[PDB]
Amino acid sequence: ASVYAWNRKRISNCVADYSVLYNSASFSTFKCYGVSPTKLNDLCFTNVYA
């Protein structure tokens, strides 16, 4: 989507594997604010907004 009309997808009722994203070399920026990437694969959240 365009930045003015950015798409929001609500991710729920599944298991989120964050190590797949973190270990990819295809991303230039993977900056996490407020949480660390190492403990993302352990913690649990109500919903994920993409």
Partner 1 sequence: RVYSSANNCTFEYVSQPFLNFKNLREFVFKNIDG
Q: Which residues bind partner 1 (CB under 8 A)?
A: 10, 12-13, 47
Please give the Cα distance from 29 to 16 (Å, whole number): 20
Residue 12 or residue 29: which is nearer to partner 1 going by CB?
12
Q: Shortest gap between Cβ of 40 and partner 1 (angstroms)? A: 22
Could you please report the per-residue DSSP string of the chain?
--STT----EE-SS----HHHHT-SS-S----SSS-GGGTTT---S-EE-
Please, what is the minimum distance in Å from the beta carbon of residue 25 to partner 1? 35
Q: How far is the CB of 14 from partner 1 (least distance, A)?
A: 11
